[PDB]
Symmetry: D3
Subunit: 110 residues, 6 copies
């Protein structure tokens, strides 16, 4: 069983997002796929279904829903959570940092 995350701060999460995700992921409504998929409205989505994106077999078949609890374990270590993913991200060790990024992703709605 995992610890719950501390409350996330979306402004800190945006800063972390720009530093750690933005070169592969756009975050704006209608933004383009690139190395990775656009992430607007990611939170709560069924995995492997962003419009236009061609996923690995692992991510296509992964069958999770991206709620914050699932994002927490995934973002800690993507390879461990989803072996076979083509997302080239080692992970974020710090619980507050993961909480902040998740809180930022949560604002990508409207």
């Amino acid at each position: 069983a995992r610890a719950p995350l501390p409350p996330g701060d979306a402004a800190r999460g945006e800063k972390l997002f720009k530093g750690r995700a933005a070169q592969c992921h756009t975050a704006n409504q209608g933004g383009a796929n690139g190395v990775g998929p656009n992430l607007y409205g990611l939170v709560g989505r069924h995995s492997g279904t962003i419009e236009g994106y061609a996923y690995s077999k692992a991510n296509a078949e992964s069958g999770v829903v991206w709620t914050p609890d699932v994002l927490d374990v995934y973002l800690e270590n993507p390879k461990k959570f989803m072996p076979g993913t083509k997302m080239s991200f080692a992970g974020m060790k710090k619980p507050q940092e993961r909480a902040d990024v998740i809180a930022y992703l949560e604002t990508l709605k409207g």
Copy 2:
């Protein structure tokens, strides 16, 4: 059979290209590969042969020639046309926009 496209406008095509392709594709002569291949001189080329580019099995084996009529069907829905492609683009569903992009691609020569 396929409905013909309307006449394309290259300037609108360029605008559409920069909004919808430019983050994966360069368009200048001798431009680099990135997410996707450089597209200078694309139109009329045998598929899966751009200098330097490491294609999916599907795109390497595809055996088409990118004439305008073929580009029409492909750009409407890449996954339907070339299942197994790693091009993360859903397609352009509006005939005029598809025609405009094709008209732009046609200018990439000299």
Copy 3:
């Protein structure tokens, strides 16, 4: 357009199947997957959906229905029809042999 096939003979089809497919494909009801999927009840099926089978991206995404006319084109040259397939079969180039195999596949029902 496609030249029609001659009428197939299922008994010749079975002989051809055992010589050219049987080492990758079972044909009995509830037969197992191996190199390739079990083919009982193949004809008329949506492509890439046989119980249990782990397909290539190309075959998973292919979106055809294996009607006889589609099987004709596919079995003549699988790589041309479905570039990116992992089916290691060059094709049957003789119309009568292709028709016979199709006639055999059509018997796999009940």
Copy 4:
């Protein structure tokens, strides 16, 4: 709660193994790789390390140990447990049959 893994019968297990697995997997000491890896001494192994076998990225990176409890969940639905696997097996859907196969696997030691 997940159903407790029932006591397995190894003789029934072998019967189930030969009907559902043997076309891809050998079970004898020093038996060959084929579609899937030789499974002698599988129980207790780190995943994705059987001598000579070229795994999918998902199975190579899976990082589990094949204890009986892990096999229970995996064998029920391989695709759910290991999305991205190339193992073409839908799963042992009946819990007693699944337990019997595990009991058979457990005997492959010496």
Copy 5:
């Protein structure tokens, strides 16, 4: 620089072939592809070109010619020679055994 192999014995090589390759590879003229390609007339062939076979990217692109010197190093350890191959064979440590198998492959002509 490698040692030359000792003279190979084709009868011993056939025995080794049946024990170590035959479940993935046929050896007869006109024999079928299976897990791996038919190997009749393999010796001296450009790599990645057997009729009908769908290779990994690595083997498709490998650009070697299968002369006995190249078969020697490859068969010792396929992964080391061709990283990314999907051939699930660890290798043969013993120079006489590799020589024998190569001498057997050399007879697959006529």
Copy 6:
């Protein structure tokens, strides 16, 4: 004999790097993965191990050390050196340019 690797100019190397590599590869300490991995401290590394990067099977299994002499051969033609790589780079075909880039890479240390 293979041409000796000429003395490289690192400033010319950086210029060549920014024109030919930077769209896929960062070069700064702690820079992000993108299309390809961050290359800080690349020289002398075991291949296929840069933190966070999800490699092709060929690059993951490559088993080389990126000394300058190995980089020379690789960078001349990546596809020839590492068949199966997903690096979309045809190669540095001019030996002085190839040496300059290596000299630049050598400076990425501290």
